[model samples]
Target: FHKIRNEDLIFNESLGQGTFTKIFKGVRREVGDYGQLHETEVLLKVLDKAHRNYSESFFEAASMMSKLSHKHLVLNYGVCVCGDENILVQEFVKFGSLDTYLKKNKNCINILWKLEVAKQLAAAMHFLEENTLIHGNVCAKNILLIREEDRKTGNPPFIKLSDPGISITVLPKDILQERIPWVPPECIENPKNLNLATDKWSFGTTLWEICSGGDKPLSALDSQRKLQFYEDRHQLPAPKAAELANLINNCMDYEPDHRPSFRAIIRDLNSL
Candidate 1:
């Protein structure tokens, strides 16, 4: 980890605000080891004092993340702490979160693009699992895609999974409640059981969101009890395509042990 001087970082605009932290688009100017001046776009996640405990986990995760390299995983630059404020620096992903992006481009995104996204996320999760890390929270909102299409092919862009710098268990209470929809039933019943297996379950729901084109898994339903009801009966909604439907079915399988591994999911998505 490097100490980023406050004066060297320029905040451009607020990206979004969470319960205990706020994200901003910024530029950092600094001299590298080779004495070259560098100006780069970065996303700064500033955490308030109440959430300062996250700093330790951020550093720990960063240590692990720095050694790993994958296309779908967001890159963590470093962390900065100035007096009362603690900040995390990450590469800027212009397209924003997948949830918002899909909502805005719901009508335009094709099934193939959605499949590509699933493959990318599965690959990322597979990386985390191989490292013995659990994303705890796997949802569309945590995934980010490139803002523009490729200059030559003009095809839909690749995505990056953000916020791998902290474990989901460290997330704030309010945010935890908000994530209930995407959480696995087994975890909800026993939070202590939350682990990599639950993450696999959550990935199933995330795929459901992608296949439905940003639609909530159970839009008309508002109760966790109802969600449990459906899961108990293995009655999750079907996706538009047969292959995707089967994938989702396997993912949301009532038995947590039955969920497919990220490697298996990636293979199926690649085949699609």
Candidate 2:
């Protein structure tokens, strides 16, 4: 693992915050490919000492993240662990998360762009499945918009998925409450093991968010009291496209194993 020195770091604005972590826009001064000094703009995700499994999860995630190399995956430069502080350095996305960008230009977005996202997401997820990795969470919030789309020219928006349980790992009822809208019912009961199908279930909800222009799924049932009957709840009707509708319907299937694999999803998308 690459260990960055404290002297080479320059943290700027605070990007955002979570229950046990925070993000900062920063600079990582490094040795250049040409053997000179380099300064790279990076987002530093801080893992706070307050988390119960901070140390163990940090090292474990760092190693696993090290082996991941893909165009759709965020590039984790390295990490800095000193005293009570732990920071994850990753590539700086130009536009930021897909959820934010989708809303800002929701009017410009079209069904073709939405399908493009589905195709890309499926390809990335298939890569992870082949590597035997299960992304516990899969949503627009976890996807990065690297480049804006050209609606007039019909060029699809460029996107990349981030934080496959590297920095954004598990938590409890407090975090679960925020995560409930996209979460499947099976996890609400067990909350333990989340497999490939569960990831597809989330992808289904995520596709809803994209196709509906960032509308939250099961948002009306986003309360603690209603979550008790979550198993019986169903998502709003698919956005009126027959082919896309069939894909989304099968994804949100209650029978976990019955959900199509990422490979199959890609095959269906290819035929579209």
Candidate 3:
């Protein structure tokens, strides 16, 4: 078994697969032929080696994440550059994806949890805004939350935005593999127009999801129906809550220039 920083190369049996990668739990061990997994914690995210575009995506994600640092962001521990296979080692986050919390315990979760949850999410959005890197796809599944037990009095959640596999790549005009509808109207037909304003539409949808306890903004429509609905902005239903309705409507507006920026969103959420 090969060793990386004293961590025994453990091929995890569990497969937490993503559209572009797979992940497994990894633990460090002593430098010995036979030793138990080390007491320290770590995680191994194995990118899909077979994907023809793997190399480019890997480089972009690593390059951008390496330059960014924030308490609300996940730290890149290290990487093992093996032939074909690239492994991203990061500090283990136990809370799993935000999607889990929103899906499983949506009803039981209290209002206090909801408010703090929104704040943690906002902090993460602010981090990316400052970095000039737009999280092209912002959804509950992409956000991995880490809870602070001591801070359970109020600020119990530690936000760390992750899964930067689907970053914005403007070149050669290739259609991205990632698909999360609710993208702004312009990006649907004119892929070239993707920018911070369009990205806010996804962010706004994510916020709506959180507020509604996992219910999607356009939950009633299917793929085909949604596409048809997108054709006409007027046909789309308004958001349920007044604050949310206004925010979602503005974000998904046909006029991209009118959409709120990340800084503006911070103020909007604070008021809500």
Candidate 4:
């Protein structure tokens, strides 16, 4: 693992925040042969001392992230662990997360662009599946986008998936429960063991978010009370596209075995 020195980074602004982590926009001050640090701007996700127990998980994640190289996956530079701090250094995506971008430009986004976004996400999902990795939380919040200079020529911004760190099980219960909108019922039922099926289920919700321009899935049933009311109903959220609507239903099937594979989802997306 490449360990970044504290003095080599200069914080610029806050990118975002989670339960125990705060992501900041920073610049790597060192001049080196680092391929991922070409632009120098990087995202620093610093874990607080309260979450020091996750230091090992962060280290392990850094090791796995270093081996991952794909157009759809975020470029992980390295990690820094000092005293009670655990920091993750990565490339700063120009357009930020899909959820933020969609919300800001929802009115201006077109159907074709949305379809392209879904296609890219499916490509990422397939890549993870091929690598035997399950993206426990496959939501719009975890997907980042980088704009291209060829926008004048009609080139779409490149999309990259991030936060491929610790498993959801390692997180606190209330924290995981708060993400119920994109989580499957099976996961809500038992957050102990999550596999490809759970990820597929989340993929469905994430696709809905993209199609609806950042609308949260099950918005009406976001609360645990409302969720339990519809828990066994086998109901799926509505989608703007008929094809995606059907796919969402199939992906969120009550039985995990009934859900289609990422490869199948990719084929359907290609046809659309």
User: Which candidate achieves the best lDDT against the true structure?
Assistant: 4
Each prediction's whole-model lDDT (CA) = 0.75, 0.75, 0.63, 0.76
- The number of the candidate with the highest TM-score is 4
Error of 3 at 173 (Å): 10
lDDT of 1 by residue, 1-272 (tens): 77788888888899887546788999988897799999999999887687777777766655655667887878887778888788888889977988878778778877877887888788888999889876776788778887545547766678888764455556644444445557666655555677788778778888888877677766565565555564566556686644588787788776888888988988888887
| Residue 152 displacement (Å), model 4 | 4.2
On the 0 to 100 scale, the lDDT of residue 145 in model 4 is: 86
Which residue pairs in candidate 1 collide?
Answer: none
Q: How far out, in Å, is residue 179 in model 1?
A: 1.3
Any runs in candidate 1 off by more than 4 Å, and if so which?
A: 58-64, 150-156, 164-166, 171-175, 219-235, 240-243
lDDT of 1 at 241: 45
- What value does the lDDT take at residue 213 in candidate 4? 72
Report the lDDT tens digits of candidate 2 across residue range 1-272: 67888778899998777446788899988889889988889988888777736656555554554577888887788778887888778888988888777788788777788889888888888988888877767888779888877768967787888774433335565566557645666776666646766788888878877887676766666466447546556555776443487788778887788889888889888898
How does model 4 fare in lDDT? 0.76
Judging by TM-score, tell me the better candidate of 1 and 3.
1
Colliding residue pairs in candidate 4 = none
Q: Give the winner by lDDT: 1 or 4.
A: 4
Every model's TM-score: 0.86, 0.89, 0.79, 0.90
Residue ranges of candidate 2 with Cα displaced over 4 Å? 58-63, 151-155, 165-170, 240-243
If candidate 2 were superposed on the true structure by all CA atoms, what would the RMSD be? 2.5
